[PDB]
Amino acid sequence: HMMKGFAMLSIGKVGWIEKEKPAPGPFDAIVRPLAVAPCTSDIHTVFEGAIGERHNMILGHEAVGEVVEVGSEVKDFKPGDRVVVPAITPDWRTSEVQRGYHQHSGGMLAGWKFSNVKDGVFGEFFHVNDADMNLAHLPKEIPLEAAVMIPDMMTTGFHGAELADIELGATVAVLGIGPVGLMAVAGAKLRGAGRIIAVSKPPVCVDAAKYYGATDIVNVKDGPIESQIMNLTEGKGVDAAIIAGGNADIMATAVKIVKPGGTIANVNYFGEGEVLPVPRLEWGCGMAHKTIKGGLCPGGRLRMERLIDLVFYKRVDPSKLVTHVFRGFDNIEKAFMLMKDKPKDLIKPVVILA
Amino acid sequence: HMMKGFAMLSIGKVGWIEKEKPAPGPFDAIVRPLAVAPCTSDIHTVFEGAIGERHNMILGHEAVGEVVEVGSEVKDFKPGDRVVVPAITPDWRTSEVQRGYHQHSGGMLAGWKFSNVKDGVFGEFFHVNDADMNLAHLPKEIPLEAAVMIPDMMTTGFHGAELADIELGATVAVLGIGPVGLMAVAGAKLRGAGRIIAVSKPPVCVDAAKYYGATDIVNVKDGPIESQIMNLTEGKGVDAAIIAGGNADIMATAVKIVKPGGTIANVNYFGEGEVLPVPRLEWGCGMAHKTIKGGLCPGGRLRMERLIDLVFYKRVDPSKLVTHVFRGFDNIEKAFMLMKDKPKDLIKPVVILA
Amino acid sequence: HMMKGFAMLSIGKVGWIEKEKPAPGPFDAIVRPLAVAPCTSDIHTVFEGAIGERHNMILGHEAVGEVVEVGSEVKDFKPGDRVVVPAITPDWRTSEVQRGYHQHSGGMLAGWKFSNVKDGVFGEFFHVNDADMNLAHLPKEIPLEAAVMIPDMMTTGFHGAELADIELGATVAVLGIGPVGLMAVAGAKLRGAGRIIAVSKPPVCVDAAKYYGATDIVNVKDGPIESQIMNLTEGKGVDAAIIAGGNADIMATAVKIVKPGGTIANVNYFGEGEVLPVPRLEWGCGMAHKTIKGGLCPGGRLRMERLIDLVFYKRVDPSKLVTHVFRGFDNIEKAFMLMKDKPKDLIKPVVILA
Amino acid sequence: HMMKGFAMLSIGKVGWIEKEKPAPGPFDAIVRPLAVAPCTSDIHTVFEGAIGERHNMILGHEAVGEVVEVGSEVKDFKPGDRVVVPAITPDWRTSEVQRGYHQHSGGMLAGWKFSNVKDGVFGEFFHVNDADMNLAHLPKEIPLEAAVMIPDMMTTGFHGAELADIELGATVAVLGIGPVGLMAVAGAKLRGAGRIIAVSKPPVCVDAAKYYGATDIVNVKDGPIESQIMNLTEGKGVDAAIIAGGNADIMATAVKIVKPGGTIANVNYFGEGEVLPVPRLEWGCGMAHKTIKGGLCPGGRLRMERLIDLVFYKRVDPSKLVTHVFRGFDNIEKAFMLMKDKPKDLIKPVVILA
Ligand SMILES: [Zn+2]
Ligand SMILES: [Zn+2]
Ligand SMILES: [Zn+2]
Ligand SMILES: [Zn+2]
């Protein structure tokens, strides 16, 4: 009745632990993973303690799997179903849900439970709260390596594009093309952007940017970002800027390149610094109408259902994000380490457990 | 001097007339057409008198052309510049512009001047009010047959999708696939729709729908729409429905297939009837939260610039709308009549003057 | 273990009956009523069968009360708590709630459960589903006759003003000034309306209208509404119109008085007709940008909490809506009858049980 | 036909100078001022060189006056008209106006022309560009000391409340109660806020705050702002926060007291510092969904007409902002200096010219 899981032992230390296999509440489900993917979040969780001290916590929160047990009141999911599990699995009966922000259901960022306040998906099984509200059915027609890009990568990048308030034909710059960065680009093509400028530090995975809708690549090795983008837009700037990675000073770049009345949409997790700087003069001394938004990705069944459809109806192919495919539980560790030691060919690895 | 122009002589009669070539005021410009396209709107105007009697009114309101004269205070356009002229050319200094509705600058629909309250583009020359605000430069790289779909077809169909409040992955139905309908399909793809259900009466121009993003074709000859669309969506309905053509009874269809909280976005010109019917029960007896919108397409310099970019950055290829291309002024009549009797191969015709 | 309740016996007949006292599930609460109100809704249900046949269904859905029993998992409400019970008490775990429409949680209007799919509040006890999500604590400082205006009247009227997209200083027309209409008048004042024109059939309850913020009274006995409003507004029309009562043709009137780009917000229950008429010409032949909205009122704890604060912080005093106050269970029968055959002094009656 | 005007001679020195009376262009008007008011902005321009060096620039930008000359094309305004002149008088024919941001018509803050790129209202005459778009008629029934609060104070404060996305019953904090702060309080009551917490530096002009709708006063002398507001709102924070004054660090306070999903609405001119700090942990490390907005107040004819109606229909009485009334041109110098330091509980002065 036991299970192995790849865990954070303490800040700096990871290892395999072994626990009682979890029991579902009346509304929850127990899922075994079919594919999983590690993210930079887990590294900052373990090695920089970006979310504080943790002890013997199974890592990972991007998984698609097979439901194996359901509580007595779970009505839409039965043992055997292939499901897509959003990284964010909020508690759906809170006053924040009545306000429309499920990401923060029960506290700030509290919709994010995996490898934060509960054991994550890097185990033989994991626990999904409120199955009927927090799982989506996975069509057979969608491959696992593509599906596992939906729980975080796709929903975050697309949320960047949602937050940017893009108008048809607007010119959009994307700052940082990690895997989320690339999805922000597809997210902008999905909101009808015209010109899409992808800005990356070397090494640039250019083909991926162009594939997902980029019209220009800006490489920081060719000069400051603000200068490159102003020159491309003949001084007008961009209608929106999506921040999908970088240091705190990238926020000032965003304000500096967005035209008045445009929007800076941040989806990046800033791990260091006490304040994120907003430049005074380039924010109009507070009046340039440059709206700044910054949000955690949506989770829950509906968001997953809606992005699955984007994948199924051939609107976006997230499989080009997957640069490494491993098989078998032992490789979960190997894949985890690839995210620390950042190589050159790497976007995102996927471990298929089958 | 004089000019040739194809006019509505009176309700029921069209023919070529002769006028003084119009002169520009200090802010206007005179354009001669390079390519023009006729629209059904002119048909409802001439043969159904949908806007009342007119006498010797040059018809047509879709053109790209060559500036030949400009007023003393026009700053961005010179004789010789190739320009895209939007169907809607409003007066930009009215209280309706400060309210955010330039389409109704000076009264309901008053932003639409060509072949409504001023002579249209089916002449050797025509008058564009407020040149710097109402003309867009045409890049050499964009062909004329494709560029002339921007003044009405592209801006209207897209406006249908803008009004529909489309969310990423939403399911969208498009009712009526004329040229405008087809652009509503492209617009829905541009707002990130997943499944897009295109509904037409036979003959369905299927290849065009599929090309611009349709995932399903509903043929009215196969049974009532509502029954077909419910069966496609396993009873759930659609998140939005864009009306781009049909009789008044199509407004009820839209309401019957949209789920509660969905949006019916109308861009169709209803030419006959006293009422457009809203079915009481399926509008929840006034409480289903099915919002209905109906709007004239945006025009002006910025709208055209933003859609030109959508063509330019390979977002939408509107050239597949153009099913008939003729050359020479004489053929304006031939093309105009093509819009009266609707044959089967016809989506949109274009007359090139060169 | 029985209880008396005032019920719809069958279509056409009401009477006091005796039922099993309800039991709460682990998430439910049992409330005894402290004050109740009858609604027109109950009339259309009983005598016109608006929601079909029913047998022994306790009527009524506006109550403030005292919790007497709670399920094992209720955390925020205990036996003894005075609470405001919203008319809409939805199931909070549905895909419609993730879409943002709890009113339609599980189907159209399904957030409306009382005297629809479950026994209403005209009993010695009634059952509130999901107490932690669907009850609000009632401060002692708020009188019961005012509090019982919050479950439907205040939230429906205010929803009318929320939907109208009222801008600061906008001119708002409210069509029909019953209790809901009067709260829409106050709703338009709370959203910053300047001029607020109240339109009523005789006898006009003017004093309440002016008291809730109306600046003009239009009496229909003095002539057609459309002609009256145009003369008041020097031909310009109104920025928004809230429909809070009338026949189906009041929709067509609303469209005729709203300026282009304005909004028609409906909160009225339309009981007869196959269609609600939208006039084609005055709706711009489908292009006047006159947006039409029609929605059921919000419910749940957060909606109630927020209106409770509006009364508590002296933003709105709903008591002037209450024209008849009785004491004792017996007078629920008398109050119900007042809703049919509506006399001249009557807005809304309240029965206090104490 | 010369005129004297109160000018910024250079950084640090002001004085009465002599200039040619300005002439109107064909669309412009010349106004003589009837009442005027100085603002802190002119101080930051004069003594801190906030907009760089200027020479012989007439100051001041809040005035209501009398039309004395009109251009050949002015159609809605004649010599003799009482007009309210908004601080922002933008050029209405730029692509930034088509995007919906007239404050930035022609560049960042470029809708603000008075005492920036043209002579301000502290002269015997001043020049209003594009009269038909930038003047509103002033009813006799509105007193001058009240009317002159509309060009800047009322429109700025209300814009703070417009930007905050306030929901009916929401809890709103206003940080800083200068004159703008007080209008922001009135703005939050006009968007239907329930609880309104006004936060000020000592000494608090309390009576004004309560008059415009404040329900709680927070004094910084009783402890840090963050600590107090958490205590008042039992840990939940406020749904929105309007910044109407303070140093750069007040932005961090704002982020710290607003709940996840709330909005920080800034209308303050931040004059010093290189960065405005957004605190990382309280901004969700980039994901708390705390939207930050910052905007220049709206201008133009319609904005003024709409605030005039709010005053006219007794929705807001701004005269309580007017604490000092002086008479005569000579007193323009005296009134200007009151704005350079903390004088009294009174603050904002008005000069009546009659
Ligand atoms: Zn992640
Ligand atoms: Zn047409
Ligand atoms: Zn009710
Ligand atoms: Zn000022």
Residue numbers in the entry:
A (entry chain D), B (entry chain A), C (entry chain B), D (entry chain C): -1 to 352
Q: Any passages from the paper?
A:
Alcohol dehydrogenases (ADHs), also known as ketoreductases (KREDs), are of great industrial interest primarily due to their ability to perform an asymmetric reduction of aldehydes and ketones. Switching the cofactor preference of NADP-dependent enzymes to NAD is of particular interest due to the lower cost and higher stability of NAD, and the higher efficiency of cell-free NAD recycling systems, for which low-cost co-substrates are available. We crystallized CBADHS and TBADHS1 in order to elucidate the structural basis for the observed reversal of cofactor preference. In both cases, the size of the cofactor-binding pocket is reduced due to the substitution of residues 198 and 199 by others with bulkier side chains, which sterically prevents the binding of the 2′ phosphate of NADP.
We performed full combinatorial saturation mutagenesis of residues G198, S199, R200 and Y218 of TBADH to generate a library (TBADHLib) of 16.8 million unique genetic variants. A similar selection procedure as for CBADH was followed but using the ALPS strain, and two different variants were identified, TBADHS1 and TBADHS2. TBADHS1 had substitutions G198S, S199K, R200P, and Y218V. When the enzymatic activity was assayed, TBADHS1 could oxidize isopropanol only with NAD+, certifying the reversal of cofactor preference. The kcat of TBADHS1 for the oxidation of isopropanol with NAD+ was 112 ± 5.7 min−1, 4.5 times lower than the kcat of TBADHWT for the same reaction with NADP+. However, the Km of TBADHS1 for isopropanol was 3.74 ± 0.54 mM, a 32-fold decrease (improvement) compared to the Km of TBADHWT for isopropanol in the presence of NADP+. The resulting maps showed clear density for NAD+ in the case of CBADHS, but only partial occupancy for TBADHS1.
